[PDB]
Amino acid sequence: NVTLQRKKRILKMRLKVPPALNQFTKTLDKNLATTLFKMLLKYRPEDKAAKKERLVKRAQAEAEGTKKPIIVKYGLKHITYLIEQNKAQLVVIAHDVDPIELVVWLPALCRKMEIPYCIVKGKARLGSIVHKKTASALCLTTVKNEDKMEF
Amino acid sequence: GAYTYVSELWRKKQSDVMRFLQRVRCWEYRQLPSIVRVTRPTRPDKARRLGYKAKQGYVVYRVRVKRGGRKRPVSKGIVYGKPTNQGVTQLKFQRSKRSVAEERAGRKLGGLKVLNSYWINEDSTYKYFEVILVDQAHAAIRNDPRINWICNPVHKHRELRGLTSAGKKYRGLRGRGHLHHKARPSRRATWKRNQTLSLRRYR
Amino acid sequence: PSHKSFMIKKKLAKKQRQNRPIPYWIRMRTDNTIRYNAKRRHWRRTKLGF
Amino acid sequence: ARIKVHELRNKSKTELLAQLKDLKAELALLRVAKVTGGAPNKLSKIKVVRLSIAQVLTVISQKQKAALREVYKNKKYLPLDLRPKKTRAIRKRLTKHQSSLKTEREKKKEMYFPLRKYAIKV
Amino acid sequence: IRTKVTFHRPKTLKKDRSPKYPRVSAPGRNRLDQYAILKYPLTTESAMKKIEDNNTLVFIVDIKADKKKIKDAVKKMYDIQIKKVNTLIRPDGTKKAYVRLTPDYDALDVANKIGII
RNA sequence: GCGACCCCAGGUCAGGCGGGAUUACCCGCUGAGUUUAAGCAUAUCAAUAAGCGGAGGAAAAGAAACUUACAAGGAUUCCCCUAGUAACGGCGAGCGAACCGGGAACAGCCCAGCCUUAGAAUCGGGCGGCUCCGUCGUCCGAAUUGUAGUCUGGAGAAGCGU
RNA sequence: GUCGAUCCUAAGGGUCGGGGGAACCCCGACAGAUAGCGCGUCGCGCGUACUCCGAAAGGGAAUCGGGUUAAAAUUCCU
RNA sequence: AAUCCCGUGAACCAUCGAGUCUUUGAACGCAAGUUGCGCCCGAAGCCAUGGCCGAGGGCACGUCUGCCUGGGCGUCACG
Ligand SMILES: [K+]
Ligand SMILES: [K+]
Ligand SMILES: [K+]
Ligand SMILES: [K+]
Ligand SMILES: [K+]
Ligand SMILES: [K+]
Ligand SMILES: [K+]
Ligand SMILES: [Mg+2]
Ligand SMILES: [Mg+2]
Ligand SMILES: [Mg+2]
Ligand SMILES: [Mg+2]
Ligand SMILES: [Mg+2]
Ligand SMILES: [Mg+2]
Ligand SMILES: [Mg+2]
Ligand SMILES: [Mg+2]
Ligand SMILES: [Mg+2]
Ligand SMILES: [Mg+2]
Ligand SMILES: [Mg+2]
Ligand SMILES: [Mg+2]
Ligand SMILES: [Mg+2]
Ligand SMILES: [Mg+2]
Ligand SMILES: [Mg+2]
Ligand SMILES: [Mg+2]
Ligand SMILES: [Mg+2]
Ligand SMILES: [Mg+2]
Ligand SMILES: [Mg+2]
Ligand SMILES: [Mg+2]
Ligand SMILES: [Mg+2]
Ligand SMILES: [Mg+2]
Ligand SMILES: [Mg+2]
Ligand SMILES: [Mg+2]
Ligand SMILES: [Mg+2]
Ligand SMILES: [Mg+2]
Ligand SMILES: [Mg+2]
Ligand SMILES: [Mg+2]
Ligand SMILES: [Mg+2]
Ligand SMILES: [Mg+2]
Ligand SMILES: [Mg+2]
Ligand SMILES: [Mg+2]
Ligand SMILES: [Mg+2]
Ligand SMILES: [Mg+2]
Numbered sequence A: 001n002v003t004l005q006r007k008k009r010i011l012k013m014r015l016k017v018p019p020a021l022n023q024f025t026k027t028l029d030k031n032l033a034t035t036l037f038k039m040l041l042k043y044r045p046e047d048k049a050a051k052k053e054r055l056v057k058r059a060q061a062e063a064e065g066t067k068k069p070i071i072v073k074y075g076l077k078h079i080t081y082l083i084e085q086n087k088a089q090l091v092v093i094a095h096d097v098d099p100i101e102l103v104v105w106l107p108a109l110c111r112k113m114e115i116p117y118c119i120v121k122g123k124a125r126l127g128s129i130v131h132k133k134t135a136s137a138l139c140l141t142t143v144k145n146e147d148k149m150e151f
Numbered sequence B: 001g002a003y004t005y006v007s008e009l010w011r012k013k014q015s016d017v018m019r020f021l022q023r024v025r026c027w028e029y030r031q032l033p034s035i036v037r038v039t040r041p042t043r044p045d046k047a048r049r050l051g052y053k054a055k056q057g058y059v060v061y062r063v064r065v066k067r068g069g070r071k072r073p074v075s076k077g078i079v080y081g082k083p084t085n086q087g088v089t090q091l092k093f094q095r096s097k098r099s100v101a102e103e104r105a106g107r108k109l110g111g112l113k114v115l116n117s118y119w120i121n122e123d124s125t126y127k128y129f130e131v132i133l134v135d136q137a138h139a140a141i142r143n144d145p146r147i148n149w150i151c152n153p154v155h156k157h158r159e160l161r162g163l164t165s166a167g168k169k170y171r172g173l174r175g176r177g178h179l180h181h182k183a184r185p186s187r188r189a190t191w192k193r194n195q196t197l198s199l200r201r202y203r
Numbered sequence C: 001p002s003h004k005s006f007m008i009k010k011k012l013a014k015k016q017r018q019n020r021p022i023p024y025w026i027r028m029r030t031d032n033t034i035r036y037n038a039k040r041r042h043w044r045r046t047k048l049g050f
Numbered sequence D: 001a002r003i004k005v006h007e008l009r010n011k012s013k014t015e016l017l018a019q020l021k022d023l024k025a026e027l028a029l030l031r032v033a034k035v036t037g038g039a040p041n042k043l044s045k046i047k048v049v050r051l052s053i054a055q056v057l058t059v060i061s062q063k064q065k066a067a068l069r070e071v072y073k074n075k076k077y078l079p080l081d082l083r084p085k086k087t088r089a090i091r092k093r094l095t096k097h098q099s100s101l102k103t104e105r106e107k108k109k110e111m112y113f114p115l116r117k118y119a120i121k122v
Numbered sequence E: 001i002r003t004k005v006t007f008h009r010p011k012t013l014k015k016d017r018s019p020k021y022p023r024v025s026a027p028g029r030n031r032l033d034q035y036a037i038l039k040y041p042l043t044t045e046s047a048m049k050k051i052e053d054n055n056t057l058v059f060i061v062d063i064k065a066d067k068k069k070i071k072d073a074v075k076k077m078y079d080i081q082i083k084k085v086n087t088l089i090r091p092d093g094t095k096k097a098y099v100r101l102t103p104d105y106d107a108l109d110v111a112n113k114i115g116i117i
Numbered sequence F: 001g002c003g004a005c006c007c008c009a010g011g012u013c014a015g016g017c018g019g020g021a022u023u024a025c026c027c028g029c030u031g032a033g034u035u036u037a038a039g040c041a042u043a044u045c046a047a048u049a050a051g052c053g054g055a056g057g058a059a060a061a062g063a064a065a066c067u068u069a070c071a072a073g074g075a076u077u078c079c080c081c082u083a084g085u086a087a088c089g090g091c092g093a094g095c096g097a098a099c100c101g102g103g104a105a106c107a108g109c110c111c112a113g114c115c116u117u118a119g120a121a122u123c124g125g126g127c128g129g130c131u132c133c134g135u136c137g138u139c140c141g142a143a144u145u146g147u148a149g150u151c152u153g154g155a156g157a158a159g160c161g162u
Numbered sequence G: 001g002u003c004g005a006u007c008c009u010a011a012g013g014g015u016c017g018g019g020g021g022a023a024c025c026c027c028g029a030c031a032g033a034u035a036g037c038g039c040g041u042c043g044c045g046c047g048u049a050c051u052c053c054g055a056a057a058g059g060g061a062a063u064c065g066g067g068u069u070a071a072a073a074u075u076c077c078u
Numbered sequence H: 001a002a003u004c005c006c007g008u009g010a011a012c013c014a015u016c017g018a019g020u021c022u023u024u025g026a027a028c029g030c031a032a033g034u035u036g037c038g039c040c041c042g043a044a045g046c047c048a049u050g051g052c053c054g055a056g057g058g059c060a061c062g063u064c065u066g067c068c069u070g071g072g073c074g075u076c077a078c079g
Helices: A002-015 A019-025 A030-042 A048-063 A076-085 A106-112 A123-129 B001-010 B016-031 B044-049 B097-108 B165-170 B187-195 C006-018 C024-028 D013-035 D041-071 D088-092 D106-113 E047-051 E068-080 E107-116
Strands: A090-094 A117-120 A139-142 B035-038 B056-068 B113-122 B126-132 E038-042 E058-061 E082-089 E095-101
Touching: A019 B016, A030 B097, A076 A106, A076 A139, A090 A106, A090 E095, A106 A117, A117 E058, A123 A139, A123 B187, B001 B016, B001 B165, B016 B113, B035 B097, B035 B113, B056 B097, B056 B113, B097 B113, B097 B126, B097 B165, B113 B165, C006 E082, D013 D041, D013 E038, E038 E068, E038 E082, E047 E058, E058 E068, E058 E107, E068 E082, E068 E095
Parallel strands: A090 A117
Antiparallel strands: A090 A139, B035 B056, B056 B126, B113 B126, E038 E058, E058 E095, E082 E095
């Protein structure tokens, strides 16, 4: 197992990489990545415990006779729909999606729709934001008005 | 809706992007054994249109099968018979490489039911397939009305009776009418029916 | 031979038990057709084959 | 006189073992009499004592099994010996609920458009 | 760092079985008790001479009984100590045990208690 | 060095599944020659016997990428007929279906993909309760590289009102 | 316990993984995270893919007289 | 056979739902022309936490779900 994974890394860089696949090596800079990830942490989806906690607050509210949340959108199927509908303002793509065909076309789609996109290192890092083991890509449909300048 | 992009990309197998990815994958598969468990399907879009679901009970295996015809397994290439049967090479197996891959997985994985399979790669020497198998004993499968049919005893070893998607192809069942009529209900059933000498009581 | 396995010795023991005459009172039962032991074996006439 | 099964079931566990111990000892003496030219009447007692030992063992085993089945009653996992035997094929079958599972559209078809009762006027 | 060029599988933790249910509801009953082990004494003329000549008792025993279990069965049955036990399998497939009692015990006295003499 | 993920390894880890047997019928593969041709090699015997596998009370097939050319039929299977016919064949020996028509029976359906995003609404397991082939609660997992709903071309989505 | 089998390995046999094979089967430690062992008291050290079968004539821990039965003994008795 | 007869009741009776079910065999610790060669758990009993004794049971392979313990810069992030 160790030998194959090391030979796999070598073989990729020995062969000529077509441009559509080579664009994923040009990931976002480390300095800008931290700023982007810091903003994402401020829009994390609610946890399982948090999700249940609000549903019991609503049940009591319903018995005793409200704002649209602003959170990160995840899921390749859902993100692609947002991009096509032109409701996405920023697309974050993982560079290490295997198989790569799942996202090798995302940069082209974002470019054709005039939606800014970035390629960041780590699908595991993206998954941690949305409380998942991994996430192929993340999307931001809208940021809170209090921080629309830095965004 | 991202699956259409993936499916359309896999229709361009001779493009630079696909030629590169398939070339690297083909090398990787050659180094591993002929039957290997894979954590997830290499072609999720292709898998789910053949019945695969991302839920406990579904498993995917990659099967490697050698390419080429079927040399007659006879010692020294000697046939004791008339010239019409003296051929040894240029003989073709009636079942396809896809069928063989399913049978190899089915026999090895006796505790699972073979659902379907699909092509993933090939070289001059080997052909690679991914076989979708279902753990019929898992509760998640048995409580799913769309797949729990495979838990019934009539569906034991579908691949060994030619009942899979590949099985229907090589039995001649993909198609009907004047070009495929002898294949139903089965080729041997048609023969026996047509050979029957019906001797009625009042004849 | 003197050197013999446990399994073979057990089989030979059973054959000896089966090599007896039928009890006399068997022939006096109602509707009896057993006249004698039809499976008698002599060590020198018929061999056990093992 | 002889052993009555319904009387055994009223005895305690210790008493059955004590009676079983006595019966086996009695049978041992009869076996000695069988090889020492015992009287024909005493040789007929071997059959009676053998029956008694089997009856006592049967009662002991039945009580032990019954108690075990009560201990594991309402438990999810039971020892294989206490699980229903039936047949191999029957045990692997889908449950009654599982066999009747259907998709949502199939459920709606049954409710919306079930088979109706009707007749043709003569 | 590694000082060995040969890779060895690292040791990993192994747990002992803790089944949620016992595979067998209860233990099986003892099929080789004292009565099962000792079927009956041998009362042949050759066997009888060994009662007094050698202080030995000849028993027919279960073929699955070993000398260790025969010794304990005789102790529980007749409450006597054994000097040594010799066993053989007879041509009829049954097992015979030559049980020699210690000098502290008299085979002839024990034989009368059994009821063979 | 500490973490996440990936791939892989070990486990008498918790709970499950598989092997083998049977031959009448059924499904897949493999596959002769005797024989016939008055010889014989294609052919025929035969898409058969033998061989190797896999099932069930039936199996297999099945809701048209069909038949047809008509004033059109309408999933599959089976019977009669078509018919020893069209066709195939050292066009020799031989071989040989199908549609229409008449009957037995009759049943239709489920997915994949654009479409929850104001909420993975889905499922499994551990534990507990109950009205225990199930259901409810709670906890830990699976899953966004997509569970459940909606849709399957005969349609359908959306809007409108009867 | 003392005679043998049992143990060891020989020509060889049967096999894991891997490679073939429609399958029955073929090759046989050759495509590989070996088996574990040692020393402390669970930790350190070592660690080259079989803890398998294969000899009543090969290798091999230990029993000698005397006596005893109709029939057993370097096995019973001393 | 003072086994059994106005009856918890005879039977080489019928039937089946309780219960028993040796060694093997797909055969599963390893083997086998061997009742041969291993390892683990352990009631009861018993001698002063240990020791002996021991009924009975466990230890095949492939594989699914979950879990525990780990390996590799395979891809990263932070010191
Ligand atoms: K031939
Ligand atoms: K021919
Ligand atoms: K639950
Ligand atoms: K030897
Ligand atoms: K020598
Ligand atoms: K001596
Ligand atoms: K051995
Ligand atoms: Mg999974
Ligand atoms: Mg002779
Ligand atoms: Mg013979
Ligand atoms: Mg001996
Ligand atoms: Mg376990
Ligand atoms: Mg001829
Ligand atoms: Mg002729
Ligand atoms: Mg001729
Ligand atoms: Mg045949
Ligand atoms: Mg079978
Ligand atoms: Mg059956
Ligand atoms: Mg029928
Ligand atoms: Mg069917
Ligand atoms: Mg249709
Ligand atoms: Mg029709
Ligand atoms: Mg005619
Ligand atoms: Mg023909
Ligand atoms: Mg027809
Ligand atoms: Mg018709
Ligand atoms: Mg969906
Ligand atoms: Mg609708
Ligand atoms: Mg509509
Ligand atoms: Mg010796
Ligand atoms: Mg050798
Ligand atoms: Mg072999
Ligand atoms: Mg192998
Ligand atoms: Mg090597
Ligand atoms: Mg190694
Ligand atoms: Mg050895
Ligand atoms: Mg040996
Ligand atoms: Mg020697
Ligand atoms: Mg002699
Ligand atoms: Mg065994
Ligand atoms: Mg044995």
